[PDB]
Design a protein around this motif. Structure first.
Motif, PDB file in Angstrom:
ATOM      1  N   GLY A 205       0.801  -1.203   0.000  1.00 59.66           N
ATOM      2  CA  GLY A 205       0.000   0.000   0.000  1.00 59.66           C
ATOM      3  C   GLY A 205       0.837   1.258   0.000  1.00 59.66           C
ATOM      4  O   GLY A 205       2.031   1.233  -0.312  1.00 59.66           O
ATOM      5  N   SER A 206       0.206   2.375   0.338  1.00 60.10           N
ATOM      6  CA  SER A 206       0.921   3.609   0.592  1.00 60.10           C
ATOM      7  C   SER A 206       0.704   4.012   2.032  1.00 60.10           C
ATOM      8  O   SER A 206       0.000   3.342   2.793  1.00 60.10           O
ATOM      9  CB  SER A 206       0.451   4.752  -0.298  1.00 60.10           C
ATOM     10  OG  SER A 206      -0.925   5.010  -0.057  1.00 60.10           O
ATOM     11  N   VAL A 207       1.311   5.132   2.387  1.00 63.71           N
ATOM     12  CA  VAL A 207       1.088   5.771   3.667  1.00 63.71           C
ATOM     13  C   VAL A 207       1.291   7.257   3.471  1.00 63.71           C
ATOM     14  O   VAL A 207       2.138   7.677   2.674  1.00 63.71           O
ATOM     15  CB  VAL A 207       2.017   5.225   4.759  1.00 63.71           C
ATOM     16  CG1 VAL A 207       1.811   5.990   6.055  1.00 63.71           C
ATOM     17  CG2 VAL A 207       1.723   3.761   4.955  1.00 63.71           C
ATOM     18  N   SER A 208       0.510   8.045   4.191  1.00 64.01           N
ATOM     19  CA  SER A 208       0.474   9.473   3.958  1.00 64.01           C
ATOM     20  C   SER A 208       1.485  10.168   4.853  1.00 64.01           C
ATOM     21  O   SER A 208       1.690   9.780   6.005  1.00 64.01           O
ATOM     22  CB  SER A 208      -0.934   9.993   4.210  1.00 64.01           C
ATOM     23  OG  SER A 208      -1.302   9.797   5.559  1.00 64.01           O
ATOM     24  N   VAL A 209       2.139  11.182   4.301  1.00 64.57           N
ATOM     25  CA  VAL A 209       3.242  11.846   4.973  1.00 64.57           C
ATOM     26  C   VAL A 209       3.097  13.340   4.770  1.00 64.57           C
ATOM     27  O   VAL A 209       3.068  13.835   3.640  1.00 64.57           O
ATOM     28  CB  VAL A 209       4.615  11.379   4.451  1.00 64.57           C
ATOM     29  CG1 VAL A 209       5.695  12.046   5.216  1.00 64.57           C
ATOM     30  CG2 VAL A 209       4.748   9.869   4.513  1.00 64.57           C
ATOM     31  N   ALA A 210       3.030  14.061   5.874  1.00 62.86           N
ATOM     32  CA  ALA A 210       3.081  15.515   5.850  1.00 62.86           C
ATOM     33  C   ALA A 210       4.524  15.913   5.582  1.00 62.86           C
ATOM     34  O   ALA A 210       5.425  15.579   6.358  1.00 62.86           O
ATOM     35  CB  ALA A 210       2.582  16.102   7.169  1.00 62.86           C
ATOM     36  N   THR A 211       4.745  16.615   4.477  1.00 63.23           N
ATOM     37  CA  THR A 211       6.068  17.134   4.176  1.00 63.23           C
ATOM     38  C   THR A 211       5.885  18.451   3.444  1.00 63.23           C
ATOM     39  O   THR A 211       4.864  18.637   2.770  1.00 63.23           O
ATOM     40  CB  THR A 211       6.876  16.146   3.322  1.00 63.23           C
ATOM     41  OG1 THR A 211       6.889  14.864   3.960  1.00 63.23           O
ATOM     42  CG2 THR A 211       8.315  16.612   3.169  1.00 63.23           C
ATOM     43  N   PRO A 212       6.835  19.384   3.546  1.00 64.16           N
ATOM     44  CA  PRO A 212       6.742  20.573   2.683  1.00 64.16           C
ATOM     45  C   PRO A 212       6.682  20.209   1.206  1.00 64.16           C
ATOM     46  O   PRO A 212       6.340  21.056   0.369  1.00 64.16           O
ATOM     47  CB  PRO A 212       8.021  21.355   3.018  1.00 64.16           C
ATOM     48  CG  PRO A 212       8.427  20.888   4.349  1.00 64.16           C
ATOM     49  CD  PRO A 212       7.949  19.491   4.512  1.00 64.16           C
ATOM     50  N   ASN A 213       7.027  18.963   0.865  1.00 65.53           N
ATOM     51  CA  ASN A 213       6.993  18.439  -0.499  1.00 65.53           C
ATOM     52  C   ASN A 213       6.398  17.038  -0.396  1.00 65.53           C
ATOM     53  O   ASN A 213       7.109  16.039  -0.585  1.00 65.53           O
ATOM     54  CB  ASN A 213       8.392  18.431  -1.115  1.00 65.53           C
ATOM     55  CG  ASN A 213       8.383  18.076  -2.580  1.00 65.53           C
ATOM     56  OD1 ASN A 213       7.486  17.389  -3.065  1.00 65.53           O
ATOM     57  ND2 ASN A 213       9.367  18.582  -3.307  1.00 65.53           N
ATOM     58  N   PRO A 214       5.096  16.922  -0.119  1.00 68.20           N
ATOM     59  CA  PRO A 214       4.540  15.640   0.333  1.00 68.20           C
ATOM     60  C   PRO A 214       4.937  14.475  -0.560  1.00 68.20           C
ATOM     61  O   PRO A 214       5.097  14.614  -1.775  1.00 68.20           O
ATOM     62  CB  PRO A 214       3.027  15.880   0.291  1.00 68.20           C
ATOM     63  CG  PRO A 214       2.884  17.331   0.485  1.00 68.20           C
ATOM     64  CD  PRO A 214       4.059  17.968  -0.184  1.00 68.20           C
ATOM     65  N   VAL A 215       5.088  13.311   0.071  1.00 68.61           N
ATOM     66  CA  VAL A 215       5.642  12.127  -0.568  1.00 68.61           C
ATOM     67  C   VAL A 215       4.675  10.970  -0.373  1.00 68.61           C
ATOM     68  O   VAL A 215       4.306  10.623   0.753  1.00 68.61           O
ATOM     69  CB  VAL A 215       7.039  11.764  -0.011  1.00 68.61           C
ATOM     70  CG1 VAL A 215       7.499  10.469  -0.585  1.00 68.61           C
ATOM     71  CG2 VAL A 215       8.064  12.866  -0.306  1.00 68.61           C
ATOM     72  N   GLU A 216       4.275  10.369  -1.488  1.00 66.12           N
ATOM     73  CA  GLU A 216       3.371   9.225  -1.493  1.00 66.12           C
ATOM     74  C   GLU A 216       4.201   7.951  -1.378  1.00 66.12           C
ATOM     75  O   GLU A 216       5.022   7.650  -2.252  1.00 66.12           O
ATOM     76  CB  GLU A 216       2.524   9.229  -2.760  1.00 66.12           C
ATOM     77  CG  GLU A 216       1.497   8.116  -2.838  1.00 66.12           C
ATOM     78  CD  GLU A 216       0.667   8.179  -4.116  1.00 66.12           C
ATOM     79  OE1 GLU A 216       0.919   9.072  -4.953  1.00 66.12           O
ATOM     80  OE2 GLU A 216      -0.233   7.335  -4.287  1.00 66.12           O
ATOM     81  N   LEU A 217       3.992   7.219  -0.288  1.00 65.19           N
ATOM     82  CA  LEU A 217       4.811   6.064   0.043  1.00 65.19           C
ATOM     83  C   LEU A 217       4.351   4.823  -0.713  1.00 65.19           C
ATOM     84  O   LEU A 217       3.197   4.707  -1.135  1.00 65.19           O
ATOM     85  CB  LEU A 217       4.763   5.813   1.542  1.00 65.19           C
ATOM     86  CG  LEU A 217       5.291   7.005   2.332  1.00 65.19           C
ATOM     87  CD1 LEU A 217       5.057   6.783   3.806  1.00 65.19           C
ATOM     88  CD2 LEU A 217       6.754   7.221   2.026  1.00 65.19           C
ATOM     89  N   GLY A 218       5.280   3.882  -0.877  1.00 65.17           N
ATOM     90  CA  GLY A 218       4.991   2.625  -1.525  1.00 65.17           C
ATOM     91  C   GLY A 218       5.812   1.480  -0.959  1.00 65.17           C
ATOM     92  O   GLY A 218       6.766   1.688  -0.206  1.00 65.17           O
ATOM     93  N   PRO A 219       5.461   0.244  -1.320  1.00 60.00           N
ATOM     94  CA  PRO A 219       6.132  -0.916  -0.723  1.00 60.00           C
ATOM     95  C   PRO A 219       7.607  -0.978  -1.089  1.00 60.00           C
ATOM     96  O   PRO A 219       8.073  -0.309  -2.014  1.00 60.00           O
ATOM     97  CB  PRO A 219       5.367  -2.102  -1.314  1.00 60.00           C
ATOM     98  CG  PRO A 219       4.078  -1.547  -1.697  1.00 60.00           C
ATOM     99  CD  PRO A 219       4.351  -0.184  -2.183  1.00 60.00           C
ATOM    100  N   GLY A 220       8.346  -1.794  -0.335  1.00 62.72           N
ATOM    101  CA  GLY A 220       9.757  -1.974  -0.565  1.00 62.72           C
ATOM    102  C   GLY A 220      10.629  -0.817  -0.140  1.00 62.72           C
ATOM    103  O   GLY A 220      11.856  -0.910  -0.271  1.00 62.72           O
ATOM    104  N   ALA A 221      10.049   0.279   0.332  1.00 58.67           N
ATOM    105  CA  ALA A 221      10.807   1.356   0.944  1.00 58.67           C
ATOM    106  C   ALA A 221      10.631   1.280   2.456  1.00 58.67           C
ATOM    107  O   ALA A 221       9.888   0.446   2.981  1.00 58.67           O
ATOM    108  CB  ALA A 221      10.373   2.721   0.397  1.00 58.67           C
ATOM    109  N   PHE A 222      11.316   2.170   3.165  1.00 57.88           N
ATOM    110  CA  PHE A 222      11.239   2.183   4.616  1.00 57.88           C
ATOM    111  C   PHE A 222      11.232   3.624   5.102  1.00 57.88           C
ATOM    112  O   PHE A 222      11.915   4.493   4.553  1.00 57.88           O
ATOM    113  CB  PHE A 222      12.395   1.404   5.237  1.00 57.88           C
ATOM    114  CG  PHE A 222      13.742   1.904   4.834  1.00 57.88           C
ATOM    115  CD1 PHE A 222      14.302   3.001   5.461  1.00 57.88           C
ATOM    116  CD2 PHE A 222      14.461   1.269   3.840  1.00 57.88           C
ATOM    117  CE1 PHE A 222      15.536   3.464   5.095  1.00 57.88           C
ATOM    118  CE2 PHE A 222      15.707   1.729   3.471  1.00 57.88           C
ATOM    119  CZ  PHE A 222      16.242   2.831   4.105  1.00 57.88           C
ATOM    120  N   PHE A 223      10.444   3.855   6.148  1.00 57.59           N
ATOM    121  CA  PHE A 223      10.294   5.154   6.785  1.00 57.59           C
ATOM    122  C   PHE A 223      10.905   5.080   8.178  1.00 57.59           C
ATOM    123  O   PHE A 223      10.931   4.023   8.813  1.00 57.59           O
ATOM    124  CB  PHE A 223       8.812   5.561   6.877  1.00 57.59           C
ATOM    125  CG  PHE A 223       8.572   6.840   7.638  1.00 57.59           C
ATOM    126  CD1 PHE A 223       8.501   8.054   6.979  1.00 57.59           C
ATOM    127  CD2 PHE A 223       8.462   6.826   9.022  1.00 57.59           C
ATOM    128  CE1 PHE A 223       8.286   9.221   7.680  1.00 57.59           C
ATOM    129  CE2 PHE A 223       8.263   7.992   9.726  1.00 57.59           C
ATOM    130  CZ  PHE A 223       8.174   9.187   9.056  1.00 57.59           C
TER     131      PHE A 223
END
Ligand SMILES: [K+]
Ligand SMILES: [K+]
Lengths: 355, 355, 355, 355
Positions: free
Chosen positions: A278-296
């Motif tokens: 899935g994705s996950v929502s992130v508040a950023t001055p340049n918002p970033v749409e998350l996806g699998p295989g990455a890490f936060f």
């Protein structure tokens, strides 16, 4: 520590399947009065009951929704739950009518966490529950007999009869100990202390029984869960076996369905986030749409602050909080993963500004 | 074993924030007399209270001293602590006035160690606290019902009423068991024993719950602390990852502020000293001013005596007691660290005489 | 499992240093009679006392026998033991004279195993004993207050007074629960159950405190003991570090002074024997005088029977029972130690017949 | 989790060797009546007794059946069991005749699981059972003395006598606490709370004693059992030492004699089957007769379903459920065992169809 078993706000069944026991027991008695809760709690009794109708039919058309076959008899569990209390509707007889009514109390047994625990209840082995058992025999007839000679010590009126030795025994065996009479002869006393430390000790023995039960359970289910989890993510396919171990045993977390602030930005915390799917929502001055295989969470890591960021799941995502010690140990284990560490810091570098 | 959490002599808050509860409760009653402690303990009541004024203002100008934001609401905790007892000053009403006064007892909650423990209280997961919970239901209505049929066994005067089954239940469920009456019919007895071993067992279950809580806590916080500690010292930067592991998991100790004899020379002891930062004072025929990146305690090691030396911190220093088994294992793991062992012995050689 | 802490038959002090408490307490009362034990138990009172004279002087000339300085104040412990009961000889006053007499009960404190346990009692750290402590506060004033409102519920005669809330509190907090009266209002009840599960739970918390105490203790002292033991034997000098680990952590046993049949030949058992120093006596058709640096028990191993042999120590020897799993793992780890396995079997081959 | 200690349906001795205690105790009393169970339970008394005859003779000709010598005195245990109750047949004396009758209760002690547990009961070492012991002394005479001064507080009628301090002591020391009177002076109270937390704590101490007993036991016997098991199978001879470790510590299971459905096909489960010796029966469209050195359960593994197959033992077989994590770790540890994984999948491929 590493686990985040967040659950969406849900009224559990416990209120509905428990409530019948509660109101029933309420009007369950007759504190010298005609009725109030009878009318009322019987009203909520047809309400709850109707809930058991609607649930049942939920099984009728949901007998198969495409549903798993894992626990077949759970169904029967339910149906009896609704049924035995049916004929519990069917009596016209004496007030013991009211008595039978509580049979629902099985309702919480519809489904619960008892399943795996029972999983090692049969999987416990641990015959020492048996040996300890016969030992319960040991103590029991021990104080039973000593209490026999002692209650028969002074015969003349109440003593010298089997009942006393029996009951004094039973309670004394306990840790509870509650009662009207004692030895007027010390011996009954001293032996009494004996049964105290003894029966209590054995209580402990059965304890350690259940304890090992806990641990073994949590272990088995946990790391096997880490089976399901390991094969479940692609990066784990590019990482060799030793690392597979490290993560399987390291990864501890749960999934957080959408609808919750997942973290707190610039608030102290220790944990890690990974996008399983899935994705996950992130508040950023340049918002970033998350996806699998990455890490936060290298936000907090390389940034220097606990939870230097926060996120929210728009879609249900499975979360895994990495143990940063073995992480640093991979960063420093080989050059490749030190490149991983640099580029990761760089991904927060670009992520913290660019798109 | 390896930890030395020495604390400078400090009167903790507990005396000041506790004392109000103590004197309050003291005069809190009226043992048939006019007043003594009222005047007295109310005097110490304005004393304590004034302490709560001065603390509060300590927050006014200390609202930010440059202070961390870690726990924001601790403040509110305090302010309520001082406030609710304010209106607890504000009643002119009946003696229950006196009653409300104790509200301070929250005071020890100002700050305490409960923070991390709660840290795994929410981080516990462990739904088996829930499953066990509903089980508490199980037993409770078990003996509740059996007690229903039984108390209704002999109706004629006191029995056959819901209250008895209720209370006998409640206490019986316990490990406490304290009371005026029993089954005159064995069945109530035998079932009673049942509820004993049962309710007790479940008590244990919740136990193992809290137990795993302990362990998991101590682990997480400990080794993460060893995160903060590992990166915190330079030598750790010249030592490869496996050793990083060994120490992170090995190092257990605390910091000892100045003002205490840290060791005892030629007195039996097992531990180790390391200068994290600062100096430490050492009695020697050729006194030696200590500094970071060195280590103390090969005195006892190579000398052959436990604590063949003693030291004192003039400046607060963070201490780390090395596990000497893995140390010997590094001495013998590679030649480089055997050179470290020789030169170390040599540093006690020069230190034990020269300057 | 691997440990054999055999002790030569010894009457411990406990009989002599305990006996005074026993007879004292015996005649300690006046069950309406003139005296018997007074004369008698006072006789054994001058006997015991004289034992305390002779022990003391044993310290006079044994003040230094060449004795270690480990525990200095143990001495003072003793001397007070003999002294305070002296002036306990010195009163002519009322029967409370007799009362003071028991002060000896400190005697078992002369020396005992409490030393190391206290070793982690201060070395425990574990502030959660403090946090739990203040929590004891929590519950205590919890039920104390609720009991305040409740005992003041029905004022008219006995209730509405602070003492009741106090005592009901104290016992209720316990797991003991023993008493004459209850809530006639349910609320006092339900809260009562609350304090049950609560105060009990916290009891558990302090438990896990002591538990971790146990473990940490046993570990520290054990493996450090394996320090003293590792460097203590020459073969350990010819074996590299990893093996040093394996044995240090593996070796668990104790020393058996002379005078006991150490084993049982052709009787089921799991353990291993090693000659640390001295000899050990062996029944063989070709008897064999044992010496250090060899090992016994490949009898059972290669022979195929548990304890296919038995031995006896003529001289006190320190014993170490090797874990045969890691042993087989060394046999199969390298060819050299497989040669060790063959030659070992051969040493039982020659030992089982030749001289 | 991995263990399957299935036992064929067996009525254990416990019913026969226990039943005498049960009926005896039943008629053991005289609830004001002539006799019923006397005639009856004495009838089952000659029945049970005759069972003890037939068992005994079972020892006569079974004194040696070729039987092991492991426990010699178990025999004597039995013979006394039958004998002491003999002369328990031999009294013509008073009703205490009936009393002696219960001596059989030793019968369950004929044989049980207490053997190994006692194995670490002597192998426990753990002198802290002693130190704690003397501590039991500590508390005991503590409250004993305080109770002395206190019971002597108010002399006039019942107090001021040694018995009260004695008994109040004994129960108070407990976790039980059950009784008729308290301090009318707070001090006796507060000290009472002291003895609560104290005596209780020490109770815990002895607990952790027994706990470590449990663990150490289960470990020792378990992994040694894995000794007997490792050398017991040929494939283990083709696998190197590290793997020997992994399995010795990994393998957990038991043997399932013939006569039971061993598994459930397409029912959720986690475990593994291995043919130690014998065959095992398998329902297949092309049925397959199992033999040693092969393994079952890659059905569920490679197939994708828990227990995608089921089996039944026609002959008693020893079962071993492999831990699939380390299995995958061998599959991925070297190419050879990845060939093992492929060919294994292929053996389910051919097995699932061909003969
Ligand atoms: K109790
Ligand atoms: K009681």
């Amino acid at each position: 520590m590493s686990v985040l078993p967040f659950l969406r706000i849900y009224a559990p069944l416990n209120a509905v399947l428990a409530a019948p026991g509660l109101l029933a027991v309420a009007a369950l008695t007759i504190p010298d009065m005609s009725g109030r809760s009878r009318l009322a709690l019987a009203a909520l009794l047809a309400v709850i009951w109707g809930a058991y109708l609607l649930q049942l039919a939920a099984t009728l058309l949901k007998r198969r929704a495409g549903v798993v076959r894992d626990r077949t008899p759970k169904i029967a569990i339910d149906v009896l739950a609704v049924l035995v209390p049916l004929a519990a509707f069917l009596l016209d007889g004496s007030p013991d009518w009211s008595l039978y009514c509580a049979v629902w109390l099985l309702k919480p047994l519809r489904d619960s966490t008892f399943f795996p625990v029972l999983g090692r209840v049969l999987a416990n082995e641990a015959r020492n529950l048996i040996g300890v058992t016969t030992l319960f025999g040991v103590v029991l007839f021990a104080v039973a007999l000593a209490a026999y000679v002692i209650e028969r010590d002074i015969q003349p009126e109440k003593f010298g009869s089997i009942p006393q030795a029996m009951w004094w025994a039973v309670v004394t065996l306990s840790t509870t100990g509650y009662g009207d009479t004692i030895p007027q002869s010390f011996a009954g006393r001293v032996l009494a202390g004996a049964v105290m430390m003894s029966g209590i000790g054995i209580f402990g023995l059965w304890a350690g029984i259940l304890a090992t039960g806990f641990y073994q359970e949590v272990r088995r289910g946990d790391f096997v869960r880490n089976w399901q989890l390991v094969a479940a993510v692609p990066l784990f396919q590019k990482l060799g076996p030793a690392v597979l171990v490290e993560i399987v045993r390291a990864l501890r977390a749960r999934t957080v369905p959408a609808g919750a602030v997942i973290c707190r930005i610039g608030e102290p915390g220790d944990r890690m986030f990974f996008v399983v799917e899935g994705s996950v929502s992130v508040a950023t001055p340049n918002p970033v749409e998350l996806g699998p295989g990455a890490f936060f969470g290298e936000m907090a890591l390389i940034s220097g602050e606990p939870r230097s960021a926060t996120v929210s799941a728009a879609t249900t995502v499975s979360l895994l909080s990495l143990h940063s010690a073995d992480f640093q140990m991979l960063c420093s284990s080989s050059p490749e993963i030190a490149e991983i560490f640099r580029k990761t810091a760089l991904e927060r570098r670009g992520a913290a500004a660019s798109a």
